[PDB]
Scaffold this active site. Structure first.
Site, PDB file in Angstrom:
ATOM      1  N   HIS A 203       0.951  -1.131  -0.111  1.00 17.60           N
ATOM      2  CA  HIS A 203       0.022  -0.056  -0.112  1.00 17.60           C
ATOM      3  C   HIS A 203       1.105   1.289  -0.038  1.00 17.60           C
ATOM      4  O   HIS A 203       1.731   1.445   1.208  1.00 17.60           O
ATOM      5  CB  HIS A 203      -0.993   0.053   1.108  1.00 17.60           C
ATOM      6  CG  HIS A 203      -1.815   1.210   0.758  1.00 17.60           C
ATOM      7  ND1 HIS A 203      -2.422   1.227  -0.221  1.00 17.60           N
ATOM      8  CD2 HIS A 203      -2.287   2.398   1.850  1.00 17.60           C
ATOM      9  CE1 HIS A 203      -3.446   2.553  -0.057  1.00 17.60           C
ATOM     10  NE2 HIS A 203      -3.246   2.999   1.155  1.00 17.60           N
ATOM     11  N   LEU A 204       0.752   2.007  -1.150  1.00 18.44           N
ATOM     12  CA  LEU A 204       1.435   3.169  -1.150  1.00 18.44           C
ATOM     13  C   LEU A 204       0.881   4.267  -1.047  1.00 18.44           C
ATOM     14  O   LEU A 204      -0.343   4.550  -1.525  1.00 18.44           O
ATOM     15  CB  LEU A 204       2.212   3.203  -2.467  1.00 18.44           C
ATOM     16  CG  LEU A 204       3.409   2.135  -2.830  1.00 18.44           C
ATOM     17  CD1 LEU A 204       2.825   0.652  -2.671  1.00 18.44           C
ATOM     18  CD2 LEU A 204       3.972   2.389  -4.354  1.00 18.44           C
TER      19      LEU A 204
ATOM     20  N   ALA B  86      -3.484   7.546  -3.368  1.00 21.34           N
ATOM     21  CA  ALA B  86      -3.118   6.155  -2.714  1.00 21.34           C
ATOM     22  C   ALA B  86      -3.442   5.144  -3.340  1.00 21.34           C
ATOM     23  O   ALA B  86      -4.638   4.933  -4.172  1.00 21.34           O
ATOM     24  CB  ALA B  86      -3.514   6.188  -1.163  1.00 21.34           C
ATOM     25  N   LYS B  87      -2.783   3.969  -3.077  1.00 22.65           N
ATOM     26  CA  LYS B  87      -3.152   2.809  -3.974  1.00 22.65           C
ATOM     27  C   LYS B  87      -2.668   1.553  -2.967  1.00 22.65           C
ATOM     28  O   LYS B  87      -1.616   1.515  -2.699  1.00 22.65           O
ATOM     29  CB  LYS B  87      -2.583   2.929  -5.413  1.00 22.65           C
ATOM     30  CG  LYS B  87      -3.666   2.350  -6.648  1.00 22.65           C
ATOM     31  CD  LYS B  87      -4.817   3.322  -6.606  1.00 22.65           C
ATOM     32  CE  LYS B  87      -5.921   2.439  -7.444  1.00 22.65           C
ATOM     33  NZ  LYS B  87      -5.702   2.165  -8.690  1.00 22.65           N
ATOM     34  N   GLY B  88      -3.534   0.475  -3.164  1.00 21.25           N
ATOM     35  CA  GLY B  88      -3.082  -0.753  -2.619  1.00 21.25           C
ATOM     36  C   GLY B  88      -3.525  -1.997  -3.551  1.00 21.25           C
ATOM     37  O   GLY B  88      -3.977  -1.905  -4.482  1.00 21.25           O
TER      38      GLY B  88
END
EC number: 1.4.1.2
Lengths: 960, 155
Positions: free
Chosen positions: A144-145, A187-189
């Site tokens: 997760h960034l 954000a992105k996971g």
């Protein structure tokens, strides 16, 4: 074995980052330096053990020095690089759940979580997220960034277990762009399963388990995520660090989850998981699921994209709500986007529509009857194109299947779509590509995938194999307008080619922004109401009641955002050609400072830039949208880093993010929201970019020489002083009433020059930094008193030209008061100098205005300022020069007004004041006036002639 | 003065000639001293110290480099030179409106800048940047002159 698990997890994260040495080489390096491996383990143990904090001074220096001396001892290059990378990962770790022992955590289920600072990791490819969390397990592996504290994005169930960090890092920029208009940042996971069940051969029980295994791993990934993440308690309002978790970072609690290609039905599961950890966001943790909004009912995305369609058609000169127009669509009346959008006009003539399953051909569609059949199809819980009545199908039309060998073509079907005259049968792939190239007014997208490419983009580079056989090129699209309800329907270069071929198109992040916007909106309300539930004002049972009661009002707020977004898009499209040079410097600033990628953002190359400059055209509509999106992100970054969201003058708009019921009932809860600074900044930047323009803030910084914070101060003061927003809404209402977009757009362009000049004036003539409330209370009231009386002192050429602009505006249906109010904007700017002057001489502003505009009449100053405006803005130095001459004219106007009001008596009007000042001049003034009239007679308006006219005006003053 | 004296010109005459464009500024110096009924010595001190801090000599020389091909361009270069000199007069008026006669030119300038506004700090920064560019067409010199002009309330 637990320390070995930690090392293995670090190695897996290293593999995702793209370390050169393989896993075999890495384990060999760790094996050949067992003393050094022990030192590494000692350093980590000293770093994260809570009991170390109970053991006196942390053994930081001892463990760190052992690791460093072992690093120095290394001779072999591969070993040296590997161990420095390992040390860098240890240093970069911000949080861990290795030490949490409460039973409900993911650590108890053998899941390890590392919250890391990717910014300090040497081996990480760019871009480096603000925060990252890595989750390791033998069954599941996820990342997760997050690019910020307040971030949003979708959770991909990826199948790229080899490198999913690569997929997530690829999608994070596009997700961040989607979030340009909303409060949080990108954000992105993404998670991969590493132990999928064995297959029973039974096609049913296998997919069931495959689903359930994915559910369990989705649960594991999110649980590992929440083991290290902070919680928010409204009992005291503070942020709590997980117990038995040693934090090296600050406090970080915001985290929401959106659905993605594999997370479609997991929102409800996510809500349960968030509840098990006792997370504060509750049902706002996941957008929708069971408590929130039925997006199919609302249809927010379709209306948000319909605002863009209507704006494009308005620029086309058509109105969808009253005139029959023809549509080709992607999807069926059972999906949210297609079903909700195709019922938005009873004048819709759906001529053709393919699907995943069937093809619909209505050669001569009706409007009332076609709408009724479309409504009947939408009301069904599920249907397909085979459910269209084949008696309401036009003659020659029909419902055909996409699985056929071929589909017959009617003469009516052929003429409508416009192909070669001989076709009498086609293949389903060619029918889809021909639907994709159609002489059709509207092209509505409600599917997923990419169906339009650029002529230069490779088919494999798009990343969509299923549609690769039907993909057409952007320059090859014959649609007049393209509406993008779906995501990734057109590539960025394809979008640029469509706009460059005469088509009307925006970016998908601007068209389908409404659905995500509603996701964020819903989150910020679920936060606010949960806070007010904790304060005892809302009983938990009426929370759901209140939410459903505000569905329509929330939707109207999001649609208002989409409309402001689209009106600004239309206006930016209008001004593209003459601001290309300004736009180009903007792009350079972003590249040099914000770490922007020219080719990645589809922004033009500098050779591409003056290629267009040589063609006399500005940015394309998708590129303009892209530029304004980055401007919105940069402005959010600038305002948030300042104390602007803190001050009350900027914070007076906070309640207006929420519906009327909450605005009234919930007032204390609104003022003490958790995302108050971010919501205020986002509102601020949205209002500024939508109202002031794309180049307002950048030109302010270029011209004035200040930071973005000072530019924002100036915009807020001018908007509150002149009622700029109110004038904009009056202009937009006239354009919505049927006034062509050219008239309303030109109205707005004069208004934006006025705000530019006025903001520059406030920045230039008042002490910095701006006290927005102070300048508002000493100017705005005076401005409101002086604006309605513009007719009492305009004389001669001023009066003639103002009347001409107001009459031209009213000739196209613009209301008369608004036409006159707009036509006098450049004199409303001079009212700032009028008010400042009246304040200096402690006399009334009425008489000061009388003298200022009468003097602007005797010398013909309007022609000189217009000539100054005709000076070139090709480069920064010539723009600076024309700005210097305009400001010199205005400052000289100030000094001459000071001298004239220093003679005579207030009862003397402007003409009498001017008569007796000239009656009391010197040889200098008579000579100056004679030279000025001669200058007016020449008609030459280059830099030199206008400059010498300005010096003539300057010498008319003793203080020179 | 040294270049003149290198060819045999007497030293007093060489220096007297080399300072002619500052003898011209002594006219404004005397007019200013008359207006404020103060001695011309201190007025000259402040005027030339101020001509030193901002590098006005380079700007006037650049103005002199403006073309005189036609009557209108000659008028333009004359306009910019007179604008520079008149702005020199107004700034000198404001600086002598602060401080005390015992304060020399450097001290007068220090405490006027110590009592400026955001306008003057921004103007000085832009002026130094203009000096850094080295471009000396009509537009750059004109914007430098507006920067100098905005340093004055009576503008």
């Amino acid at each position: 074995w637990q320390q070995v698990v930690v090392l293995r997890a670090y190695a897996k994260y290293l593999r995702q980052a793209g370390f050169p040495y393989s896993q075999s080489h890495i384990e060999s390096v760790l094996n050949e330096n067992p003393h050094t491996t022990r030192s590494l383990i000692d350093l980590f143990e000293a770093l994260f053990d809570p009991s170390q904090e109970t053991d006196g001074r942390r053994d930081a220096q001892g463990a760190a020095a052992a690791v460093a001396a072992d690093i120095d001892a290394l001779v072999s290059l591969d070993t040296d690089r590997v161990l420095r990378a390992f040390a860098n990962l240890i240093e970069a770790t911000l949080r861990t759940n290795y030490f949490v022992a409460r039973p409900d955590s993911a650590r108890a289920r053998n899941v390890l979580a590392f919250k890391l600072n990717p910014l300090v990791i040497k081996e990480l490819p760019l871009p480096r997220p603000k925060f990252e969390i890595f989750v390791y397990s033998p069954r599941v592996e996820g990342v997760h960034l997050r690019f910020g504290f307040v971030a949003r994005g979708g959770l991909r169930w990826s199948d790229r277990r080899e490198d999913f960090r690569t997929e997530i890092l690829g999608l994070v920029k596009a997700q961040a762009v989607k979030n340009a208009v909303i409060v949080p940042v990108g954000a992105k996971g993404g998670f991969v399963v590493k132990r999928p069940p064995t297959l029973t051969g039974d096609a049913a029980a296998d997919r069931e388990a495959t689903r359930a295994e994915g559910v369990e791993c989705y649960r594991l990934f999110i649980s590992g995520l929440l083991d290290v993440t902070d919680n928010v308690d409204k009992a005291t309002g503070a942020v709590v660090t997980p117990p038995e978790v040693v934090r090296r970072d600050g406090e970080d609690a915001y985290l929401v989850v959106a659905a993605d290609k594999g997370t479609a039905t997991f929102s409800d599961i996510a809500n349960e998981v968030a509840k098990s950890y006792g997370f504060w966001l509750g049902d706002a943790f996941a957008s929708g699921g069971s408590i929130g909004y039925d997006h199919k009912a609302m249809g927010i995305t379709a209306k948000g994209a319909w605002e863009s369609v209507k704006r494009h058609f308005r620029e086309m000169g058509v109105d969808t709500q009253t005139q029959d127009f023809t549509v080709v669509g992607i999807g069926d009346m059972s999906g949210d986007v297609f079903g909700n959008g195709m019922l938005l006009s009873k004048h819709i003539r759906l001529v053709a529509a393919f699907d995943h399953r069937d093809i619909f051909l209505d050669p001569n569609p009706d409007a009332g009857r076609s709408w009724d059949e479309r409504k009947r199809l939408f009301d069904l819980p599920r249907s397909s194109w085979a459910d269209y009545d084949k008696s309401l199908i036009s003659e020659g039309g029909g419902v055909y299947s996409r699985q056929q060998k071929s589909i017959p073509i009617s003469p009516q079907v052929r003429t409508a779509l416009g192909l070669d005259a001989d076709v009498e049968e086609l293949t389903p792939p060619a029918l889809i590509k021909a639907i994709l190239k159609a002489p059709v007014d509207l092209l509505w997208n409600g599917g997923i995938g990419t169906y339009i490419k650029a002529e230069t983009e490779a088919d494999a580079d798009v990343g969509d194999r299923a549609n690769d056989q039907i993909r057409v090129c952007g320059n090859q699209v014959r649609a007049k307008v393209i509406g993008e309800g779906g995501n990734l329907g057109v590539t960025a270069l394809g979008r640029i080619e469509f706009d460059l071929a005469g088509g009307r198109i925006n970016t998908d992040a601007l068209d389908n922004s409404a659905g995500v916007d509603c996701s964020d909106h819903e989150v910020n309300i679920k936060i606010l109401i949960d806070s007010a539930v904790t304060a005892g004002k809302v009983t938990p049972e009426e929370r759901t009641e209140l939410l459903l009661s505000m569905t329509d009002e929330v939707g109207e707020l999001v649609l208002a955002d989409n409309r402001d977004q689209n009106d600004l898009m239309g206006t930016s499209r209008a001004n593209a050609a003459s601001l290309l040079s300004v736009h180009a410097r903007m792009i350079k600033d972003l590249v040099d400072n914000r770490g922007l990628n020219r080719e990645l953002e589809a922004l033009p190359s500098e050779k591409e830039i003056r290629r267009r400059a040589d063609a006399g055209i500005g940015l394309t509509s998708p590129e303009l949208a892209t530029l304004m999106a980055h401007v919105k992100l940069a402005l959010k970054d600038d305002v948030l880093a300042s104390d602007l969201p803190d001050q009350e003058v900027f914070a007076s708009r906070l309640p207006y993010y929420f519906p009327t019921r909450l605005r009234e009932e919930l007032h204390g809860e609104i003022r003490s929201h958790q995302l108050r600074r971010e919501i205020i900044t986002t509102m601020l930047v949205n209002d500024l970019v939508d109202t002031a323009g794309i180049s307002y803030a950048y030109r302010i910084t270029e011209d004035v020489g200040v930071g973005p914070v000072d530019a924002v101060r100036s915009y807020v003061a001018i908007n509150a002083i002149f009622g700029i927003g109110d004038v904009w809404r009056r202009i937009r209402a006239a354009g919505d009433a049927g006034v062509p977009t050219s008239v309303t757009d030109r109205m707005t362009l004069d208004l934006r020059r006025l705000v530019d000049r006025a903001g520059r004036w406030l920045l230039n003539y008042r002490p910095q930094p701006l006290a927005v409330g102070a300048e508002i209370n000493r100017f705005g009231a005076k401005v409101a008193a002086l604006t309605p009386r513009m007719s009492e002192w305009l004389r001669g050429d001023d009066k003639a030209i103002v009347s001409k602009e107001a009459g031209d505006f009213a000739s196209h249906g613009v209301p008369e008061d608004l036409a006159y109010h707009i036509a006098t904007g450049l004199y409303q700017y001079s009212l700032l100098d009028v008010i400042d002057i009246a304040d200096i001489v402690d006399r009334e502003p009425d008489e000061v205005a009388d003298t200022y505009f009468a003097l602007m009449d005797h010398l013909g100053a309007d022609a000189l300022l217009t000539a100054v405006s005709r000076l070139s803005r090709d480069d920064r130095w010539h723009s600076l020069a024309r700005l210097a001459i305009r400001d010199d004219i205005y400052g000289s106007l100030r000094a001459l007004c000071f001298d004239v009001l220093a003679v005579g008596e207030p009862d003397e009007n402007g003409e009498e004041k001017i008569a007796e000042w000239e009656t009391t001049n010197s040889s200098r003034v008579t000579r100056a006036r004679r030279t000025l009239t001669e200058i007016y007679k020449d008609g030459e308006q280059d830099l030199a002639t206008l400059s010498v006219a300005a010096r003539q005006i300057r010498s008319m003053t003793r203080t020179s």
